[PDB]
Structures are given as structure tokens and as C-alpha cells.
Amino acid sequence: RFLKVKNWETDVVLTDTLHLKSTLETGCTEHICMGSIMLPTKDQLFPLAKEFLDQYYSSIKRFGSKAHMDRLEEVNKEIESTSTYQLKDTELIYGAKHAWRNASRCVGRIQWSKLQVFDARDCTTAHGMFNYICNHVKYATNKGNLRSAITIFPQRTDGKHDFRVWNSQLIRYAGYKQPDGSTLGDPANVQFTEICIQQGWKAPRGRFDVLPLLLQANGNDPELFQIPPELVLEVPIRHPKFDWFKDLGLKWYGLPAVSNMLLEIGGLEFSACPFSGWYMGTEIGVRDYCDNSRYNILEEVAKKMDLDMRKTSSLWKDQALVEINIAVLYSFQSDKVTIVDHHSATESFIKHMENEYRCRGGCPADWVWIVPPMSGSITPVFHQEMLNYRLTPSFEYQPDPWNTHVW
Amino acid sequence: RFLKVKNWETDVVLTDTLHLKSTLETGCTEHICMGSIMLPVRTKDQLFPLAKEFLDQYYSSIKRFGSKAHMDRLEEVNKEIESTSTYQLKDTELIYGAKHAWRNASRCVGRIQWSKLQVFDARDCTTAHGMFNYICNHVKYATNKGNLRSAITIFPQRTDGKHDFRVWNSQLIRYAGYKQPDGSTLGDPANVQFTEICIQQGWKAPRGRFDVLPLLLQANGNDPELFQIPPELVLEVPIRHPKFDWFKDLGLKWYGLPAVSNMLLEIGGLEFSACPFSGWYMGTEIGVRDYCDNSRYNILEEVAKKMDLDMRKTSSLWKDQALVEINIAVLYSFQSDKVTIVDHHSATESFIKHMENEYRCRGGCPADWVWIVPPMSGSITPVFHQEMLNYRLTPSFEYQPDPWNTHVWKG
Numbered sequence A: 001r002f003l004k005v006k007n008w009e010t011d012v013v014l015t016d017t018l019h020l021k022s023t024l025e026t027g028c029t030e031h032i033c034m035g036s037i038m039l040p041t042k043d044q045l046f047p048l049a050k051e052f053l054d055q056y057y058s059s060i061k062r063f064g065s066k067a068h069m070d071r072l073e074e075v076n077k078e079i080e081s082t083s084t085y086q087l088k089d090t091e092l093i094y095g096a097k098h099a100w101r102n103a104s105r106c107v108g109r110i111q112w113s114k115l116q117v118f119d120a121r122d123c124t125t126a127h128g129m130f131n132y133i134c135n136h137v138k139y140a141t142n143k144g145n146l147r148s149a150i151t152i153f154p155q156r157t158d159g160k161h162d163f164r165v166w167n168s169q170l171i172r173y174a175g176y177k178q179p180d181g182s183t184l185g186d187p188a189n190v191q192f193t194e195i196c197i198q199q200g201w202k203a204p205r206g207r208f209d210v211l212p213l214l215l216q217a218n219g220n221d222p223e224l225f226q227i228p229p230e231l232v233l234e235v236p237i238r239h240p241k242f243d244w245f246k247d248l249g250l251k252w253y254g255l256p257a258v259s260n261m262l263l264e265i266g267g268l269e270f271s272a273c274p275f276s277g278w279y280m281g282t283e284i285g286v287r288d289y290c291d292n293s294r295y296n297i298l299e300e301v302a303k304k305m306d307l308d309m310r311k312t313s314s315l316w317k318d319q320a321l322v323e324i325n326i327a328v329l330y331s332f333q334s335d336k337v338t339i340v341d342h343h344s345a346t347e348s349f350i351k352h353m354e355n356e357y358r359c360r361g362g363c364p365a366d367w368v369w370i371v372p373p374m375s376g377s378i379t380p381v382f383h384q385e386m387l388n389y390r391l392t393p394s395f396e397y398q399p400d401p402w403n404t405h406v407w
Numbered sequence B: 001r002f003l004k005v006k007n008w009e010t011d012v013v014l015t016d017t018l019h020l021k022s023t024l025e026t027g028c029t030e031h032i033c034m035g036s037i038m039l040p041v042r043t044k045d046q047l048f049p050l051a052k053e054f055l056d057q058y059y060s061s062i063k064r065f066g067s068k069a070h071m072d073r074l075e076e077v078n079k080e081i082e083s084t085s086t087y088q089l090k091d092t093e094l095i096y097g098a099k100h101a102w103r104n105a106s107r108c109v110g111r112i113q114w115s116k117l118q119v120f121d122a123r124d125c126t127t128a129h130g131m132f133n134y135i136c137n138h139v140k141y142a143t144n145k146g147n148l149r150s151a152i153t154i155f156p157q158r159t160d161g162k163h164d165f166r167v168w169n170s171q172l173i174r175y176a177g178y179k180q181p182d183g184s185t186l187g188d189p190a191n192v193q194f195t196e197i198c199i200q201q202g203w204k205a206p207r208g209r210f211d212v213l214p215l216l217l218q219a220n221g222n223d224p225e226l227f228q229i230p231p232e233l234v235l236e237v238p239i240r241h242p243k244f245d246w247f248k249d250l251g252l253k254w255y256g257l258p259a260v261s262n263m264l265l266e267i268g269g270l271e272f273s274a275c276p277f278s279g280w281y282m283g284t285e286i287g288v289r290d291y292c293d294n295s296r297y298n299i300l301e302e303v304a305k306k307m308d309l310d311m312r313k314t315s316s317l318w319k320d321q322a323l324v325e326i327n328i329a330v331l332y333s334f335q336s337d338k339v340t341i342v343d344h345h346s347a348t349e350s351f352i353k354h355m356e357n358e359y360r361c362r363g364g365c366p367a368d369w370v371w372i373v374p375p376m377s378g379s380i381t382p383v384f385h386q387e388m389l390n391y392r393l394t395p396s397f398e399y400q401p402d403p404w405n406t407h408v409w410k411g
Ligand code: HEM
Pocket: A100, A103, A105, A106, A107, A108, A109, A111, A115, A148, A149, A150, A275, A276, A277, A278, A279, A280, A283, A340, A345, A369, A395
């Protein structure tokens, strides 16, 4: 019932009580741990509503008050009458902020409470969606001084009228499968890019083509929009010592903005809720650049450093990896685009865990995702036991829309 | 019930049926995953099912399930349990059991080698001098002048829990740590406690940075006894770097032979509380963890100083740079001295092949991602992108409490 987590570097022991509130399931059993798997009615709705409003009214220290009881009856009467309900602005902001607070895979949560929430529940068309998104992009980018934000389109109704952003990120690069046999640009986005072309996009067929938005409103067929180029801040990648690095033609965008997830607050489902923060360096340098199935540039870089690639044991991949990552961080810092390195981000998360344990009785965390994909054991999160459990409000995956949507 | 695991780099999808033969629990529930928790006297009643289950596995593997030899062995074990309250394994059952414990070790990336294991049966051992001799022979055979060979030595099983055989050392070869009055540590901070015990038991500590610890050996539940491994048997590698000539002047070396001596081997319900085993190192065990943990030799600062990295801002990745050069040095040193070692690229690639073969032939390969992914350069190794399923098969290696916490001192 009370659970302990030890840090094996500092011997610090923390007691988790928060997990008893856990309200969704993990995919694990006593017979099998699924910790490393990527993806494991009016009656239903009121408990969910109650559960959330109880926590909300607890947070403003008004639990069991008149205002609390009144709201609970209001929502009860709204559900029984309308089969759903609407969140007050204060509730909405709280729910979004907590969805991030509870994201067990997010290392950047020390920032959870500084989230700008843009209420787009009045949106009705894809064109409106595009306006709301451009404003989000520009507000968050902030000339390089990045600011966390989320924009929240209308909640699901009968699920025949969903709002969806088809892009997986607001800003991503196209991928085209070539007669050659290889892949030009980002191999992660072939299927979506093809979908764009099929809906009508004029693809330029470059390596770093910013994808168009594909926006679905009120269950309708989605439409294409190009984000004003002047709103998409990009960074050319150079190395502080290797002059030749720039000759790779590498760039990345400043704004990371996940657009394909579902926000669940008090039982209500917000299927279009793009949110953005700022990058940890390894996300681009290790994953985007080096993943065999991504831009996969290790071989090229190594050659330019003139390393012995005859034998795995010269650690040439590791040598090139560090340099690629040094360059990402240098390039962003020099251009004054907010970025954080894995040492600093994981140290911050450790301070955040301790705060959550002391002020909330715990912090759900998924070690598999929290430990950076390079230099794991020299960051403090490596040695930190973590308990992973599912709290609501939350962000959830949802099927890619082209699998669901009927045209 | 079938379970799928996907590789996100290759899209290879595998199907596990083997998790169905799982007995022991995980620590996880439907409501909480404990997959990153480090550490998540049997009756007759409990013993016979465990025996039967083991002997069923064994007779299947030799293609003799349900033979007369199979039924007779069951009945013979049956009686031995009913009459003596325990039982003895045949040599072949022990070999098989020790190999399977390794095969089943979900946190071990080196399992492609599981069927090549030299088993030394030390169940006739009765004294701590006896154990010492057994362990010297294991050390010599395993070392093999640098061409390392996997081996395990198996001392008599637990009886009433009052007569346990234990090796108090966590590894057969490890360096002393000495906490100084000024609060700093000389040698390996990981071994301070055990070092103190050794000194308390009467070891004369040389007090250097790399002193091989004496063996501390308990036989038959008796108080343990100190023995120095003959230095001629302790293969060491001095650490130097291929391009950086100042690296040797750091004064570093390490031992060639990784040999865990504090785990418990469980076979068919029987508990073997002293069962030291050894293989060979993956380079990152020394260069990432032994040298670079803040709680260990903690050499990252000194190395980066000497490389003249920019150390004012963590964002130079000075730590990451030093870490790679240290690990380059470790592998270069071992290879140059012809001591067996494997890098983390080669080991993880080998593990992925092992894992697919295991799915094809055994219907599964239980695997702990937290432990299998190397502690540097995780995502440019093929395990990072491999979904794994973690579950517990017997035979197995388990932890046990350190014996200085449980031992009843005789005097
Ligand atoms: C502000 C700085 C932020 C940093 C440094 C950061 C960092 C990260 C990183 C490194 C990951 C793992 C990424 C991967 O390997 O794909 C991640 C995942 C995640 N982040 Fe954060 N993030 C930030 C902002 C935000 C915000 C504003 C939100 C939501 C409002 C958010 C929600 C999430 C969620 C739900 C995941 C896991 C998603 C999944 O399971 O696929 N992050 N974050």
C-alpha cells in the first residue's frame, strides 16, 4: 500500500502514496511485465465527472463546500439531460495542466504549471482550426524564447463529429519513397505525406519539406493548409569545431508540438489538443538524426571525422553520436532558440520528483522513456527507481484518423 | 494466449507462448508497474510439485518425457522427499538446471552463450578450505590465460537454512574500498562495507586503490574464513588509450574475470546458496559503471580535465565525450592483452539474434529492457527499439540478503 523508491546513487528513499489513486490500467500483471511495450454512457460518465471535480475542489482548498456540492449537482443535472457536460474555464485549465503533470513518460514536467491554455471550444470549421493553430505556433515560438502551450478544440460528442489534427506533430518534415529504392527526407512520415499528396498537396520533393496541416472539424473530411513559412522557425545545424558539418545540409525546427493525442478530463475526451514545449537535444541529435529508420546519418558523419569503421569496438558510432549531439545544442544556443541538454533536463526532473513526493505523495514515471537514449547511467535518472501508474486527467494515444474516418 | 512484441526499427513482430509456463510473480500489478525497481526452508508439501515440474522439463529436453526412466525418477524423488524431506539431483540434472537458470536470466544480455557453461559440481565440499580450493580451480579454468570460458561452481544445497554454504564476497574478484576520516574514499566505494568486514575478520589491508579482496567463505553454516586468492591466478589489465598517451598515467587497471558469487541458484525447488558463476565482461560494465558512476571510481572529471574539454557548461557534453574515450580505452586495453571482452554493439546485436532464435525454438525469451539496454548510447544499439516481455521461469538465479545481516555467529 505504501511504496518505496530508492535512488541507488544517493541512497535517498521516497514513499509513494499517490499510486493508490491510480484509476486506469498498466498492461502489466503479476505474471508478466509489459513495461517496455510502446502501446499496451451516462452511467460511466458521472463517476468520472465526480472524481475530477472532487480533485479540482480539493486543489483550491474548497472540498465539501457549498460551491463544490452545487457544481456536482449542476454537472449531474447536465449529464442526465444532455448525456455530457461542459467544463468551466478554470476546470479546463486545471485539467490540461494536470494531464501534463500526470504524463509518466515526460521528463520535462517541472514546468507543468506554466502552461498557456488556449480555449478553442468555440471552433467550428477547419479554417478556424488553422487560425487557432497559427496563433498557437506563433505564441509558443516567441522569436526563439519558447513558451509551453496547448490549444483545446471541442470535445467528442457521438464520435461521429470529432475534431482531429491528422499530423502527428504540427511541424514535421515530409518523406517520399523513391524509384531509387531509398527514402528522401524523413522516413517516419511517408504514409502521412502520401495522404497529403492524395488530398492534393503539391509536394516540393525536398529533404526538409514542412508538411501541410490536415485538419478535421466536426467529423467532416479534413482539409489542407500551409503554415506561414514565417511562423516556422528552423535552425541550420553546425558544429563549433568541425567546419565541414554544415555541408551535410542539416536543419531542424525549433518547436516540438505533438498534435495526435487525446486529452481526457473528467471523462470528457478532447481528441484535438496540440501541445508544445521545447526540445531536449537528444530528441533531434540521437533519435531524429541517428535512428536507423530516421535520417540515419551516423555513417556519413563518421566518414567525415575519418574514424575507423572497420570494427564496432573502435566505438566510432558513439564518437559520431556525441558530436552530432554537441552540434544540435550549439546550433540552437547560437540562434537563441530554447533547448535543454539531457544532463540539465534529467537533473531538473529529479528535483521535480522530490517536490512531487513531498507535496503530492508521489510522481508517476516511466523509466524506459525518462532515461535519455544516450549516456543513460551518467544522468541521475538512471539510478532512480520509479513507479509507473496511470492517473487522470491524462494524454492518451488514439488510432491514426485515416484508419477510423469515413469519407 | 499469444503475446506480440514489435521491433520499432525493423517492424519484426514476435509471438510469445513461453510466458504461459511462468511460475514466480513479477512485482507488477494491473495498477502499478515495478519494472525499474532494482530488488522486487521449504516444506515437503511445496517441494514435490517443484520437483515434478523440473523433472518434466528435463525429461522433455532429452526427448524422454513419459518414459520408464522418467516415471522411475519421479517415484525415486517422491520417496526421497517423503523420507528425507529433500532430494539430490543427478549430475545431468544439475548441469541442465544451471544452464537453464542462465538461459532464464531475463536481465542478462550475454545469453547467446547459455549452452556453453562449464559446471563444476562441488556438492561433496564440506569446509571453507574446501571451498577455497574449488574457487581457485574455477578462477584458473575460467581465466584460461585470457581466453575466458564461462563456468559455475555449485556447492551443497540449503538444508534447514542453518547450515548454508555462502561466499560472502559479492564477486570472487573485486577491489577493496576504504572510507577515509576526511570522508573521501580510496579504492572502490562499492565495497567499503565488505572491506570493513574483511578487516574485522583479520585481513591486513594494503590500503591502495586496487587491492584484490580476500575471499570470505562460510561452509555448513559455520563462521566464515579468510583466504587470499593466489595473485598469479588474478588476471588484470592496465588501462591505456590508443591515441591518448596520458591515459596510462591515470593509474587505472581492472580484473579480467567477472564472477558473481552472492546469488542463489534455484533448481526443482532446491536452493543452492553458494554458486559463483563467471563469463567475460562487456566493455561498458567497467568503463561506464565501474569507472564513471559518481558512487564508484568517478573518473569523469579527471579524464575531461586532461582532454581539455569545456567543463563550464554541461551542454558541451564534456561528460559524454570523456565517457566514450574511457570506454574506447577499456576495450583497446583488453584486446591488446588478449583478454576476452565484448563491446556493447556486438553484445546487443548478438542478443537480438539469440532472442529471435529463442522465440522460434522455445516460443519466447524473457527479457528485462531496463537492464539489457547498455548504460551508454542506448538507442544506437538494436535492443533499445526491441519490445521485450519480462517474466520469471525456473530454474533461476535469485538474490538473497547479504549474509552479515542473517548469519548467527558461533564464535
Ligand atoms: C517544456 C519542455 C518539455 C520537455 C523538455 C519535454 C520532454 C519530453 C521528452 C524527451 C519526451 C519523450 C519524447 C520521445 O522520446 O518521443 C516527452 C514525452 C511526453 N511529453 Fe513532454 N516535454 C516538454 C513539454 C511538454 C508539454 C507542454 C506537454 C503537454 C502539455 C508534454 C507532454 C508529454 C507527453 C504526454 C509525453 C509522452 C508521450 C508518449 O507517451 O508518446 N511535454 N516529453
